[PDB]
Amino acid sequence: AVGACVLCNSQTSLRCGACIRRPFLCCKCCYDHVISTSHKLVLSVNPYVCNAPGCDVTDVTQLYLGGMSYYCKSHKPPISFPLCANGQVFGLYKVTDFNAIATCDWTNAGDYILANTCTERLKLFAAETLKATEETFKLSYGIATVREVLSDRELHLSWEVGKPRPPLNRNYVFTGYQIGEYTFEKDAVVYRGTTTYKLNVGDYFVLTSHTVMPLSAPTLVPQEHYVRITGLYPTLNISDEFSSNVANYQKVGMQKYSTLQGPPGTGKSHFAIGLALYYPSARIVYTACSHAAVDALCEKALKYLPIDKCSRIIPARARVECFDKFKVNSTLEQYVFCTVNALPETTADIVVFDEISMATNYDLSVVNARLRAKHYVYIGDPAQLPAPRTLLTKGTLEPEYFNSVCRLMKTIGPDMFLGTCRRCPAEIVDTVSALVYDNKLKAHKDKSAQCFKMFYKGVITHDVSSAINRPQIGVVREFLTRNPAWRKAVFISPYNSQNAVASKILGLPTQTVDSSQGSEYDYVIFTQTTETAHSCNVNRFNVAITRAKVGILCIMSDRDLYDKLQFTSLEI
Ligand SMILES: COC(=O)[C@@H]1C[C@@H](O)CN1C(=O)c1ccco1
Ligand SMILES: [Zn+2]
Ligand SMILES: [Zn+2]
Ligand SMILES: [Zn+2]
429 CA to centre of ligand 1 in angstroms: 12
CA-nearest residue for atom 16, ligand 1, is 446
Q: Which atom of ligand 1 sits closest to the CA of residue 447?
A: 8
Q: What is the structure's resolution, reported in angstroms to one decimal? A: 2.1
* Pairwise CA distance, residues 407 & 358, whole Å: 13
One-character DSSP codes across 435-474: HHSTT--EE-SPP-S-EEEEE-----EEETTEEE-HHHHH
Ligand 1 binding pocket includes 429 (Cβ within 6 Å): no
Q: Which ligand is nearest to the CA of 20?
A: 3
**Would you say 498 and 529 are in contact if contact means Cβ atoms under 8 Å apart?**
yes
Alpha carbons within 13 angstroms on the beta-carbon side of residue 301 total 28
| Cβ within 8 Å of residue 358, ≥6 positions away | 288, 289, 290, 293, 380, 385, 386, 387, 517
| Cβ within 8 Å of residue 398, ≥6 positions away | 109, 113, 410
**Would you say 552 and 567 are in contact if contact means Cβ atoms under 8 Å apart?**
yes
One-character DSSP codes across 512-542: EHHHHTT--EEEEEEE----STTTT-HHHHH
* Pairwise CA distance, residues 419 & 379, whole Å: 14
Instruction: Kindly give the pairing relationship between strand 548-556 and strand 510-512.
Output: unpaired
CA pseudo-torsion sign 413, 415, 421, 426: positive
What's the Cα-to-Cα distance from 155 to each of 142, 184, 368, rounded to whole Å? Answer: 18, 10, 43
**Would you say 561 and 482 are in contact if contact means Cβ atoms under 8 Å apart?**
no
Q: How many CB atoms lie within 10 A of CB 344?
A: 13
| Cβ within 8 Å of residue 450, ≥6 positions away | 425, 523, 550, 551, 552
447 CA to centre of ligand 1 in angstroms: 7
**Would you say 288 and 313 are in contact if contact means Cβ atoms under 8 Å apart?**
no
DSSP 189: B
Q: Which residues are annotated as a binding site for a ribonucleoside 5'-triphosphate?
A: 262-269
* Pairwise CA distance, residues 9 & 127, whole Å: 18
Instruction: Kindly give the pairing relationship between strand 3-4 and strand 11-12.
Output: antiparallel
* Pairwise CA distance, residues 293 & 385, whole Å: 13
Ligand 1 binding pocket includes 424 (Cβ within 6 Å): no
Q: How many CB atoms lie within 10 A of CB 471?
A: 15
Ligand 1 binding pocket includes 447 (Cβ within 6 Å): yes
Q: Which atom of ligand 1 sits closest to the CA of residue 442?
A: 1
148 CA to centre of ligand 2 in angstroms: 57
Give Dmax (Cα) for the chain: 93
Ligand 1 binding pocket includes 443 (Cβ within 6 Å): yes
50 CA to centre of ligand 4 in angstroms: 5
Ligand 1 binding pocket includes 426 (Cβ within 6 Å): yes
CA-nearest residue for atom 14, ligand 1, is 446
Ligand 1 binding pocket includes 441 (Cβ within 6 Å): no
* Pairwise CA distance, residues 257 & 351, whole Å: 9
CA-nearest residue for atom 10, ligand 1, is 446
One-character DSSP codes across 271-298: HHHHHHHHSTT--EEEEESSHHHHHHHH
Q: Which ligand is nearest to the CA of 427?
A: 1
DSSP 215: P
| Cβ within 8 Å of residue 408, ≥6 positions away | 220, 259, 414
Ligand 1 binding pocket includes 451 (Cβ within 6 Å): no
The burial class, CB within 10 Å (0-12 / 13-18 / 19+), for 448 is middle
Q: Which long-range contacts (CB under 8 A, 24 or more apart) does 90-93 make?
A: 90/27, 90/65, 91/12, 91/13, 91/14, 91/27, 91/30, 91/42, 91/44, 92/2, 92/11, 92/12, 92/13, 92/14, 92/44, 93/10, 93/11, 93/12, 93/13, 93/26, 93/27
**Would you say 176 and 122 are in contact if contact means Cβ atoms under 8 Å apart?**
no
β-partners of residue 71 are: 64
**Would you say 94 and 73 are in contact if contact means Cβ atoms under 8 Å apart?**
no
Instruction: Kindly give the pairing relationship between strand 284-288 and strand 568-569.
Output: unpaired
Q: What angle do CA 198, 202, 207 make, to 5 degrees?
A: 85
| Cβ within 8 Å of residue 249, ≥6 positions away | 234, 242, 274, 275, 278, 279
DSSP 52: S
Instruction: Kindly give the pairing relationship between strand 15-16 and strand 42-43.
Output: antiparallel
For the chain, how big is the Rg over CA atoms in Å? Answer: 27
Ligand 1: which of 421, 422, 446, 566 to mutate, most ligand atoms within 8 Å of CB? Answer: 446
**Would you say 557 and 531 are in contact if contact means Cβ atoms under 8 Å apart?**
yes
Q: Which residues are annotated as a binding site for Zn(2+)?
A: 5, 8, 16, 19, 26, 29, 33, 39, 50, 55, 72, 75
For residue 434, the SS3 value is helix
* Pairwise CA distance, residues 419 & 410, whole Å: 16
CA-nearest residue for atom 2, ligand 1, is 446
* Pairwise CA distance, residues 142 & 144, whole Å: 7
Number of H helices, E strands in the chain: 15, 33
CA-nearest residue for atom 3, ligand 1, is 446
Alpha carbons within 13 angstroms on the beta-carbon side of residue 250 total 9
What's the Cα-to-Cα distance from 386 to each of 55, 145, 260, 302, rounded to whole Å? Answer: 49, 32, 16, 28
* Pairwise CA distance, residues 365 & 387, whole Å: 15
Q: Is 449 left (phi over 0), alpha (psi -120 to 50) or beta?
A: left
CA pseudo-torsion sign 70, 74, 77, 81: positive
CA-nearest residue for atom 8, ligand 1, is 447
31 CA to centre of ligand 2 in angstroms: 9
Ligand 1: which of 431, 445, 447 to mutate, most ligand atoms within 8 Å of CB? Answer: 447
Instruction: Kindly give the pairing relationship between strand 181-185 and strand 144-149.
Output: unpaired
| Cβ within 8 Å of residue 493, ≥6 positions away | 499, 502, 512, 513, 526, 527, 528, 529
* Pairwise CA distance, residues 567 & 570, whole Å: 9
